[PDB]
């Protein structure tokens, strides 16, 4: 039973002013809805489409293409660990193994209570500063397996 809220709708129409076409606001509109609800539900695809004046198959095409826009329910805190080449040399596999022991899940899966979802991600742009991970909008560098339980405790 999806409805666009009156503040999400005003935020989408705020960014339609900054482009020639309202089609250009589609990425930000998906991120606006996901920021409020954790993920983009199925009824939000038709909701965003009718506001922007583009077909729903165009909105769904964009949302499935982009990795960060989520079309499946996630946890309260998303853990995104780097698995690219410089983090592979600095020991990401030990970080991945420590994350799979504290959480008792596999990447792509959420925890049973729904607190955390574990996802691999590309290079975060922090390659010189060691193995890297992100929890929500927070970047943690110089990762060690011993640091994994204390770091996770902050996010409840």
């Amino acid at each position: 039973a999806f409805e666009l809220s009156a503040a999400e709708r005003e935020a989408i129409e705020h960014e339609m002013h900054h482009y020639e076409d309202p089609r250009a606001a589609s990425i930000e509109a998906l991120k606006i809805v996901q920021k409020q609800r954790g993920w983009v539900p199925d009824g939000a695809i038709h909701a965003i489409a009718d506001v922007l004046g583009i077909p729903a198959s165009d909105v769904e095409g964009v949302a499935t293409f982009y990795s960060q826009i989520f079309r499946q329910p996630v946890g309260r805190h998303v853990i995104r660990y780097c698995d690219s080449v410089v983090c592979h040399i600095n020991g990401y596999q030990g970080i991945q193994a420590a994350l799979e022991k504290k959480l008792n899940i596999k990447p792509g899966q959420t925890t049973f209570d729904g607190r955390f979802t574990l996802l691999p991600t590309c290079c975060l742009g922090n390659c010189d500063k060691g193995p890297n991970m992100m929890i929500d909008e927070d970047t943690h560098a110089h990762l060690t397996p011993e640091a994994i339980p204390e770091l996770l405790e902050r996010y409840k």
Binding site: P55, S57, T64
Partner: peptide
């Protein structure tokens, strides 16, 4: 209006 392409890489639908 109701046909499109979804996904990315080798999983395009």
């Amino acid at each position: 209006t109701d046909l499109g392409v979804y996904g990315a890489h080798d999983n395009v639908y």
